[PDB]
Design a protein around this ligand. Structure first.
Ligand SMILES: NS(=O)(=O)c1ccc(NC(=O)Nc2ccc(C(F)(F)F)cc2)cc1
Ligand SMILES: [Zn+2]
Length: 258
């Protein structure tokens, strides 16, 4: 209820209301590239976003979510480590106050400027709320952002942020094509984990792409102008909305590539 990313309500406090914060399959994690093992058993990853139907963008006080119509199999993720069909429901990002931090996952302890999460639920469970109660309910495709060249397919997102500055604001966001946020390669790492925000449910198969996308400094600067607060409340810039790496415990990270 009053969780956030500050000193007084941040990740080190979450366990009091959400004891699974100290569980056995929490996310994010550091991806040690030397220890991850290539797995021949992985099937090809299939990202099928041609019929994706975006609807709205919402500042929820923690990030902003671009939401999709998930009432039919329009935009789906299949293959890789996944059994069956996972429907896209929303994407969001986590980012930093500085270009050297912001990602949730790390790669050999490297932090990226931001991380995109494309969230999908397993259609065998009928709805998102049921899926999050299952160990294989969700698949989140995570994509790192580094600062360099602009990402043209992100600009429509950046340009609507002025209209959702504060918590609880939303705006129409139709006809956005999430294909424009992907890198060229679908090479990935995968492991079983959790939501990275309360309620921290252990329901996610994480698929983290190896290739980052590049976004411009100007693009990420606009993310940092958002607010965690509601309208008419003291301004708190929406920055550093990332959970740090958690203990790997009894898990193995698998690579799709040699
Ligand atoms: N950072 S992360 O990728 O691990 C992650 C964290 C929290 C969530 N939660 C939701 O998407 N919640 C949600 C979606 C959708 C609905 C619906 F509208 F269907 F009720 C109700 C709740 C997802 C992902
Ligand atoms: Zn996330």
């Amino acid at each position: 209820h009053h969780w956030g990313y500050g000193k007084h309500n941040g990740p080190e406090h979450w366990h009091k209301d959400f004891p699974i914060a100290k569980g056995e399959r929490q996310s994010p994690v550091d991806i040690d590239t030397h220890t991850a093992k290539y797995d021949p058993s992985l099937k090809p990853l299939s990202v099928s976003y041609d019929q994706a139907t975006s609807l709205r963008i919402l500042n929820n006080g923690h990030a902003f979510n671009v939401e999709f119509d998930d009432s039919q199999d329009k935009a789906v993720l299949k293959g890789g480590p996944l059994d069956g069909t996972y429907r896209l429901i929303q994407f969001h990002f986590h980012w930093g106050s500085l270009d050297g931090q912001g990602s949730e996952h790390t790669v050999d302890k490297k932090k990226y400027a931001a991380e995109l999460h494309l969230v999908h639920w397993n259609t065998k469970y009928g709805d998102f709320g049921k899926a999050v109660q299952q160990p294989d309910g969700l698949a989140v495709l995570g994509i790192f952002l580094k600062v360099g060249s602009a990402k043209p397919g992100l600009q429509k997102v950046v340009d609507v942020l002025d209209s959702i500055k504060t918590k609880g604001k939303s705006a129409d966001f139709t006809n956005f094509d999430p294909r424009g946020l992907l890198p060229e390669s679908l090479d990935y790492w995968t492991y079983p984990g959790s939501l990275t925000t309360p309620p921290l449910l252990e329901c996610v198969t994480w698929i983290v792409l190896k290739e980052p996308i590049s976004v411009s400094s100007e693009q990420v600067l606009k993310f940092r102008k958002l607010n965690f607060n509601g309208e008419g409340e003291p301004e708190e810039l929406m920055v550093d909305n990332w959970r740090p790496a958690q203990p790997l415990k009894n898990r193995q990270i698998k690579a799709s590539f040699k």
